[PDB]
Structure formats: C-alpha cells, structure tokens
Amino acid sequence: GKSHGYRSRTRYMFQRDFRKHGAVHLSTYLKVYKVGDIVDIKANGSIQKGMPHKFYQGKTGVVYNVTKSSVGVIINKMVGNRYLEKRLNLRVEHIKHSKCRQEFLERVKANAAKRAEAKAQGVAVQLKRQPAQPRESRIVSTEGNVPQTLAPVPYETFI
Amino acid sequence: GIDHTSKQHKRSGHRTAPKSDNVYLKLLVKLYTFLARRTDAPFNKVVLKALFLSKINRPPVSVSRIARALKQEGAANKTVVVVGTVTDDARIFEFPKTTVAALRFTAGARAKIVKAGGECITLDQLAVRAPKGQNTLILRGPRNSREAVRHFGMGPHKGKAPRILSTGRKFERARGRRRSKGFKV
Amino acid sequence: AKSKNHTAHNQTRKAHRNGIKKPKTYKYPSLKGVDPKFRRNHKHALHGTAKALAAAKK
Amino acid sequence: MAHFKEYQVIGRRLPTESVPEPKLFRMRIFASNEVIAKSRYWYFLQKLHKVKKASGEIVSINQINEAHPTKVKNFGVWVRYDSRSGTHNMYKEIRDVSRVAAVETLYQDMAARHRARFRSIHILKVAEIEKTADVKRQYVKQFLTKDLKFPLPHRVQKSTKTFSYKRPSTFY
Amino acid sequence: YQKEYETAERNIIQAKRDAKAAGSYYVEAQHKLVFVVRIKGINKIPPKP
Amino acid sequence: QANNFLWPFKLSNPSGGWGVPRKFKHFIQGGSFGNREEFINKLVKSMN
RNA sequence: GGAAUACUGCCAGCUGGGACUGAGGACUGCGACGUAAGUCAAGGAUGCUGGCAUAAUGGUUAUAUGCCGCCCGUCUUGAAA
RNA sequence: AAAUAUGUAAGAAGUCCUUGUUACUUAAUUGAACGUGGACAUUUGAAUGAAGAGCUUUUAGUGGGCCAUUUUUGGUAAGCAGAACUGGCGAUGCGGGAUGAACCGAACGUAGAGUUAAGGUGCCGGAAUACACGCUCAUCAGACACCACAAAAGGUGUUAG
RNA sequence: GCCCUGAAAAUGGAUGGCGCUCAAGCGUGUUACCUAUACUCUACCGUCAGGGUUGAUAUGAUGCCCUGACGAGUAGGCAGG
RNA sequence: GGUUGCGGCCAUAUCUACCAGAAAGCACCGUUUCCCGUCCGAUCAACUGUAGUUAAGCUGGUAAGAGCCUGACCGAGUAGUGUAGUGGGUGACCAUACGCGAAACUCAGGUGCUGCAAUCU
C-alpha cells in the first residue's frame, strides 16, 4: 500500500547543491539570532538533527525562542479554512536571516533621514514608493540613425 | 446580473428594540430614543442600546462593585449608572454615599445604599438630572462569569468543563483524563 | 459496488465561504515553549522594574 | 485585416545609459487601423531582432498614401504562407490602381485559392513592375495588349419588383 | 481649464511638426489614463480575473 | 479619491452595435476586448 | 506653385420627422432672461377642442387564430421515459 | 533551467536620543529582555478596492456526485476506469446550438420604451434572393465550433504556385 | 486548393425541412438588418441600509416621511401571514 | 610590494607541463639525554639554530594548455510556457492575438579578491 513517511517525497528537496557537499562553512554558525528576527527556513540534509519537516521548506517565519543550538520559529500554516499557528525548533544550519527584512530596515533609516533633511529645510518630503510610471514624451533624432527598413523573410529549410 | 461580493438582504445583527413587552421598559426606551436622537452626548446612545439587551447580557452589578468603582481617582462624586439590576453584597462593610441609577434594586441594595445616606434613582429620573449623562459612571456586570460559559469551546486540551450532570470520581475521570488510563485529554 | 475514492473538488470553494481570515495577532503573545531558565529570570527582572516604578512614586 | 491602409511603422529598443540612441527600424505594414499595424510591427520585429514591445517603443506611425492613385499599375507580389501541410513562398501579379487595392485582392485570392486565412500569410514584397513584359504572368499580360476590347455577354439586370410583365433579355 | 487644455493640445501638435522639421520624431507621452468597460456577463468566470 | 467618488458608470449596449461578428476575441483579431486605444471613444459614445 | 476634396476628429452650432413615459401634489432649492416691473423650458404636464349613453370603455367567460406548452409524485450524476 | 503557481516584507505594536531593572549573560554596566524621560504625525512611508470591521454561541441538510477546457495515469479502446486546477451541471429558468443536464450568450421581482449578446436574415421564420474578389459541377457535390467520424494511396479534372 | 476514386448493412428519411449550382455551396472582405428574463432610462411590489420626525398642537411611534441599492434556487434554516 | 600566524568568501583559487625567485620569513635540514610514540625518531615527541640547501615545499611567470569564472541584440525573441477565439486541420498537430521567456551553441574577456596581527632591502 501507500507510503507517507516523514521524509517522504524529499529526494531532490533535501539534496545538496551540485559540487557543494560536505562541511558547512562557519558563517552559518556565526550568524546571531534574536527573538523577533525573520528567518527563511531551508533544510540542509547533511545535518539530520534539528531539521524542518518538508512542509516548511521554503517558508519564512519569526524567531520566538533562542537556545544553545537552535531557534524556535513561528510559522502560520493553513489547515482547512484557517491558519493555525505553528512553532518549530530548527537547528541553525537550516535557517537564514530574511534578506528582505534587511532592505526594509535600511529604507526605514533612509526614510528617517530623508525626513530630517526635509524638516531642517522645512520642505515637503514624499517618502512612499510610487510604481513605475507611464513615460514622458521624447524627441528621437535621426543624425546617424536614419531608420533601417526591414521586411519579412521567405521560408527556407536548413536541414 | 451582478457579481455580488456580499450577502444581499443581510440584516444588521443587532437588536433594534427590547424583546420585552414590559410597557414601562418601552417607555424608558421611548425616552432614551428621543434623548439619543436629539442630543449629541454619547451617553444616551450607549444607555439606549443597553435597554435592548437580553437578560444574559445584563448581568447584575453589585453594590461592592459600585463601592470599588467609586474609589477611582476623581470618581467619588459621579453618579453611577447600571442599565440593569443592583444586588446586595454583605462583603463590603464601609459603603459610601452616592447616587445610583438602575433598572432595578434588590431590597438589600436599596437598603445598603440608602442607609449610607445615598440615593436610588430610576433611569428617567437620571434623565432629567442628566440629559447629557453629565458626571455619570456607566457600570457593567461580569458577563462571562455565568455557568453556561464554563462549557464553551469544550475539546481536547481546551481546559473546559464537560457538560456533566452528576459529579465525583466515577464520572468522567478515567480513560482520557489521566496518563494511567489511556491518554490524558 | 465500487464508488468514488477521493477528490479535492469543491474543497476550496467551501474553505473560502467564511474562510481564511489570518492569524489572530497580539502584542504580548504566548510564552509557550520559551526557555524555562530565561523565563524564570525574566520574572525577577519584571518584578524589580515594577518595584522601582512604584519606588518612584513615594 | 479588412479595408487596408498601409503604414510606415518606425520603432527602436528603449535607451540604456549604455546605449542611448539605439538604432531605428522601419516596416511598411498593411492593416486596417493603427492598433493592428503596431501589433504587426512587433510581431515581425520579434522574429527578426531580440525585442519584445516590453523592451522597445514605437517612435512614429504614419500612413503612406498611394502616389498616383489613378494610374493603373501591374504589381509584383511576393508572399510567404502556411498550408495545412507546410509553408511556401509564392510570387503572384495583380493589376490595380493602388498597393492598398492590390494587397486586398492578394488576401482574397490567398483565401479563395489556397484557403489561407490572414494569420497564415506574410507579405514579403510588393512592387510596381516597371517595364511591361517583365510581367511574367499570363492572366495579367492578357490585359496589356494594344487596343484591347471585349464585350460582356449575357447581361442580367436586377429587378426592382417581384413580377414583370415582359420576358427579360440579356442583350448588352 | 479651457485654456490649459487648449494649449496643451496645441503644444503637442507643434511639437510634432518641429521634430519633423528637424528631421526628428516627436514621440508622445504614454497615456496616464484609461477607461475600462466590462463586456462579459457574470457567469463562468475564473477566480483571479 | 476623485475617481472613487464616481460610481461605476452604467452604460447601455452600444447603439449601432459592436461592429464585429464576435465580441470575445481581441480587438486586434476582429474585435471587442483588449485595448482598442483611441477607439474606445467611439464605442463608449454609443454606449453612453 | 497655389488650391480643392476625401478621411478622421471637435463644437456648451442651428434645425425636421417618429415612438414610449407624465411618477409627484401649497411654498421653500440651483438657476436663467430681462434696465426694470416682471417672465421662464429652472427640485416630475399642462392648455385648447371634441366623443360616449339602453353607449365609449373595462372585467369575466366560450370559441377561433399566431406562437409556445411532454405526467405528476419519487429515488437518482441523469426521468416525458 | 523556465512559464503558471508559492513564502515574507512595504512601519505608532514604528523610528531615534537619554538611562532604569535582573537571580539570565558577559573579562567587564558587557549583552539580552522589559521599561521611565525626551524628539519626530501633510505623502506616516507603493497600487486598487472596501458594498462597514472584529467577535460569540448554537443548530439544519450533506457526507453516491457528474460534466467541459487544460495537465494527467491505467487500457487497443470506450458515452471506460482513476487524479490535478478552475469553471459548470446537480439546485436554473431565459436567448442560441432543429432536438438536447453539462457547449455558446446570459443568470431570473411586476411591467413600458430603447439597445444588444451568442446565433441568424431564399421560403418554412423575425431580418439584404445585400455588396465585393475568387474557387467548385460530383451517373454518391457541398453546406459551420462542442457534434453526431473517415485514412493510407491515387487522378492528363480544374485552379494558383 | 476545390472536385473525383479509395467509400460495404440491414423498416423509408433526413445540411432541422423545402429546395439551392456566377448558390441558398467553399475561402475572404464590407455595410445594413432581426432578436433574450442581459444592458440603459422610467413606473410599481418587496428586501436591506442610511436619514428625518409626537417640541406644545385628533385619527396608526412596532408609525409617518426622505434617500440609495438590491431580487435565481433543491436539501435546508429563519420570518410574516 | 614580499613573508609568516589566524582567517573570510571557497577553482578567477583547481589541474598538467616548463621556467624564475633578491631580503626576511617559511621550509627542508643536524641530533636522540630528557617527556612521548613507532615493526621502523619515516610519522608523532623532545633537543640544537648549531653543520648544510633553495633541490623540493612555497610564491610568482609561461601556455592559440585541460578546468573554472564573466559578458554579449552568439544562437534566440528560438524551445517551453500564462491567457484568447463557434481560429485552421479527418486527425496528428499547427497558426494568429495580449504576455513571459530558456538551455546547448558561438564568440570576447579573465585566472583569486580580501580582514586582523607580526616582520622584511
């Protein structure tokens, strides 16, 4: 009959990257984690302890606990018509600071600053992002760029 | 047709009037809906609504509970309003003066309040004195203190009370309630 | 007689009638599963800062 | 795909700091309105240069009117097209007063004879044929002979009413 | 507003003629605004659209 | 804020028709649906 | 070289014919035209004329005519079966 | 190594400055948490929409499903059996497909006027025996999605290449 | 490409039928026209929502009045009769 | 700039072959009383820095060098794909419309960068 073990379906998911097998470099053990940090989970199948179950591969949550060798992470998982709150104890080999929370904090600073120079000039700011806008009129010149005219091409076999 | 985004002909989920047929209550209502409409004053809007509430949602406010609220800084002279009934409580000894407007006083509560030199007012009487609710303290009973609510949300690990009719060891205390008998909860 | 065996058909229609909402977020969340030593010391930390706040009210 | 107008479409890749002033390319496109013409411009450009209209822009679109819209010309028409079973190049000739008039009969003719709808044909070249008898195709040469005349036998007049009180004739 | 409009439109027209005159091409600003009309009725529609 | 204050416009069917045998193809393909660009004015005017 | 015309678009440009509707019921509003008093097509029709009395007209009913209309109830993915 | 699908973020529960608490932690008032006091509200930190948001109790029916496009497994195949996402039928009339559960259009209070959809306009039947360029003659022509089947292979028929 | 051969089944029969051959057939283009319980505008019924109003002043305050939107339904729930 | 110790990233750093390297460093290198380990002072331990050498290590150069890296309207807007039609086709399958978009290929360029501390003609 059917088979649904814990690591069922995981052959390509927990595999190591091509020409990247072996010891895990120390950077991984030098990152510091704080309650409230945002991490992305991604299994390292060379470290079998403290390992996220495969549903959580590729998912991002919040740190809620810090321990000798692991962080606890809060993931919101959808079961039925409702998210349930899940907490995971992942070892550090399987976790990584979320890079987008970093752009975000950087921008919050940038924002505070833009606000500062604006006030200490007493001017309007405009701090929120606009999306890509239509495009304004241009004049293209023809100096050195007299348009080359093209036509469709006859069918032909190359075999 | 229309791709409706929301239920059509849905009725606000709120009482619009008391379910009671007590003429007097309707009159208090008739008073307050004039007041609610014709003054600004958040107070009457609140008191208006509270008149519609069913009995489970007017839990009683007790006389010690009024004693306590009166100890709020800057509250001692407020007139305390209970859109429901006030009950006696042999547990405070020293009870202070004030003026309580309520739908109903139990006999002991009237006594208590009166004996301490205070006054018992009905809501229309409170209306004339305070058409805008000036210097009032609205109080509400503990609603989730009710026996019914002990059993809500009953389930594995929920910490709730079974709907049992009869209690002791020998009634729902064995398999599923202790590690030694199957599992625990 | 054999009958049908499984399907998800209709299941998302059903989940989305009332469904999905989201988490139920609070400030001051469940300290469930947080390091016991740590908590035990947090207690004492909080007691003390409470103490002093009241000490600064004479 | 209808009553045709012919357009110059001129476009280019969007400027980069690396290449401001990228090269300009033109096509002459036969279409009925300009929304079709620019579509058609991109369809061809994408088959000829790496560009999707998301990386390019149309710089100019201009209708090209026939210069001598009442001189009769004999046109050479070059066409690529798909059959149910392959794809073919084909040279045909058309006698008319305007390219736009010629092209439209090209499309009807590809439909009639080869069952080629519009999606299936590319116009490769269309050209007034300068010297008579560079004309190669009998069914157009026929008209080029000196003092050409012909009758139109068997004339059928349309009737305005349902009954007629005389037996009609075809006499021209 | 009558003026605003009248001179924006005129402006654009002359822009084009000047480019032509310089052997250039004026290329108009991309549209900032659209009107959209729904033309399909309401049955059988895929959730995302 | 201005645009939102405007309720959705309720147009009639176009008076004079859609001008194509079939609406549910693209304007580029013989008609109705998609961006017909400037030609929206003619269509909306007959619907309004 | 100077025009015209087509095509496409704009006008808070002027006008003819036909059709359905006329909800509301003192006055309050926004305006327009007037030098003015006043007038008005400006928060929903008025005015003038005529026709009908054992009648004009309306309800019902029978029948004809045009088009349309399978037997209900049930179980069922599916019943006129 | 795509496309489609998929996680998180886009701030007042935020930011910055000052310096309080502890039994944790550090060589160390060092960190870590949680705070006092002080400063910053026009765009306060993309878009679009919001027909109000949040929450509680309780209870009906159901728990045979089926169909279409697309992905897809078993099978020679099936109007066969079995999955994926969505939309349907079932529970639903209406207009079109002559007919028809499921296709196309479009979803429904009682009506008037106008306009259309999908589909049509010789006659049955409301609507051009309309306009335009070709192609086709069948002693078994052909005639419209789902759809009510046709192939290999041949023709000095006729067309254009 | 069209057409022809390849092309055999049982009651009599189906491009829906008649019939149609520079089509009423096949490919393509352009206009006009017909028509749904859909769209637009208006009346009326109901449902939901928001708002006004017993301040002294005849007859319904669960009433009167103003305004906007909405209406498919088996099993089934509730309501008003 | 060299060199060493401890590193970060982990081939632009690896591989094969041939050259070249001042100074200091590093190394090879001399010894076996001692602590210590071997079948074997080879490794491992200790001792001298004394007798020797750049041979090797190591560093750098060379190469139409193997690999690795990077770029490119090189291939290719191709393959594949989201969405659309009462589109074509007996079908297999294909074209068009609004979008997204590879890999191999080819050619061009490149062959470690860097943090801390010490030391050096």
Ligand SMILES: [Mg+2]
């Ligand atoms: Mg095109």
Ligand SMILES: [Mg+2]
């Ligand atoms: Mg392409």
Ligand SMILES: [Mg+2]
């Ligand atoms: Mg082909």
Ligand SMILES: [Mg+2]
């Ligand atoms: Mg083609």
Ligand SMILES: [Mg+2]
């Ligand atoms: Mg469709």
Ligand SMILES: [Mg+2]
């Ligand atoms: Mg478009």
Ligand SMILES: [Mg+2]
């Ligand atoms: Mg087909």
Ligand SMILES: [Mg+2]
């Ligand atoms: Mg150095």
Ligand SMILES: [Mg+2]
């Ligand atoms: Mg680094």
Ligand SMILES: [Mg+2]
């Ligand atoms: Mg020894």
Ligand SMILES: [Mg+2]
């Ligand atoms: Mg030894």
Ligand SMILES: [Mg+2]
């Ligand atoms: Mg030795």
Ligand SMILES: [Mg+2]
């Ligand atoms: Mg040694």
Ligand SMILES: [Mg+2]
């Ligand atoms: Mg060495």
Ligand SMILES: [Mg+2]
């Ligand atoms: Mg070495």
Ligand SMILES: [Mg+2]
């Ligand atoms: Mg070397």
